[PDB]
Amino acid sequence: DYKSITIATEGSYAPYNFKDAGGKLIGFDIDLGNDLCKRMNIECKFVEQAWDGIIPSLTAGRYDAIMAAMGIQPAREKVIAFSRPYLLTPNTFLTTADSPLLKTQVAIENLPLDNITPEQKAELDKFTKIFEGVKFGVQAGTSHEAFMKQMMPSVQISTYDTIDNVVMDLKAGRIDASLASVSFLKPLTDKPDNKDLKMFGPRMTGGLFGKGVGVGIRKEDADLKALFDKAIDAAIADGTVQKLSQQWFGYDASP
């Protein structure tokens, strides 16, 4: 059935998918994608696609799959299908190294959002109250924007086309804080370039954040999903995902 597939990626989300000095698409998603396709015995072709319109371009048949740090989110599951997750990561807050937000006590380090108890709601509510007067910046069309608008609506938020513009505005002092996964924030804050940026708050999973990072596939492409699932299961089992995770993120984020 399948001989060759076209995989779309954004190219603005390091270390998942970004551009090298020669403008070539590189990253965890590119390496994993190529490895998965070798296992599936199909030719792999990566294409650049802006995050805004990545989902409708898949459904319109511009390409066959999405590998762009995309979380398996319930709102996304309404429109497209996903492979089983190839990476699992919590989500946390970002600010500057001199921010008093860093002095905030974290009562729940690992906060699941699937069935929010009064205790867990009290923790979210504390941060919402601390975030009053704090300017947030997030990338548009993310689980982070959904979380902020639904869980912390009283918080002032600005949405950006790319995560690079968020980071730029945070370093420039135009925004006070952000929200993204640990898989994005840890390699960012590990860089000596960004020793003036720090992660803080609970490490949140589930709810609006979804079930992990997966390959976006059209709902009617059941055979392609089944092929990706087989390949992902094997890449996890043999330690390939762990290897690529350590190589790109500096830690093991494999399921």
Ligand X SMILES: C[C@@H](N[C@@H](CCCNC(=N)N)C(=O)O)C(=O)O
Compose the 57-86 pattern: x for residues touching ligand X by CB under 6 A, - for all others. Answer: -----------xxxx---------------
Which positions from 140 through 159 interact with ligand X, judged by CB under 6 A? Answer: 142-143
- CA gap 43, 203 in Å, rounded: 38
Binding track over 81-120 against ligand X, x by CB under 6 A: ----------x-----------------------------
Q: Which residue of 7, 10, 66, 240 would you call a contact of ligand X, by CB under 6 A?
A: 10
Q: Does 248 bind ligand X (CB under 6 A)?
A: no
Angle made by CA atoms 57, 141, 251, in degrees to the nearest 5: 100
CB of 215 to ligand X, least distance (A): 12
| Cα dihedral 66→69→72→73 (10° resolution) | -110
Alpha carbon of residue 121 to chain centroid = 23
Shortest spacing between CB 141 and ligand X, in angstroms: 7
Q: Per the structure block, which two tokens stand in for 139?
A: 């990338």
Long-range contacts for 113-119 (Cβ within 8 Å, ≥24 apart)? Answer: 113/151, 113/204, 113/205, 113/206, 113/207, 113/208, 113/209, 114/206, 114/207, 116/207
Distance of CA 113 to the CA centre of its chain: 16
Number of residues that bind ligand X (CB under 6 A): 19
| H or E stretch covering 253 | none
- H-helix or E-strand spanning residue 234: helix 222-237
Give the residue, chosen from 18, 51, 131, 249, that forms a contact with ligand X under the rule CB under 6 A. 51
Piece of the chain touching ligand X by CB under 6 A; list 98-106, 135-143, 151-159, 232-240: 135-143
Q: Which of 28, 184, 228, 248 binds ligand X (CB under 6 A)?
A: 184
Q: Name the site residues for ligand X (rule: CB under 6 A).
A: 10, 12-13, 17, 51, 68-71, 91, 139, 142-143, 163, 180-181, 183-184, 213
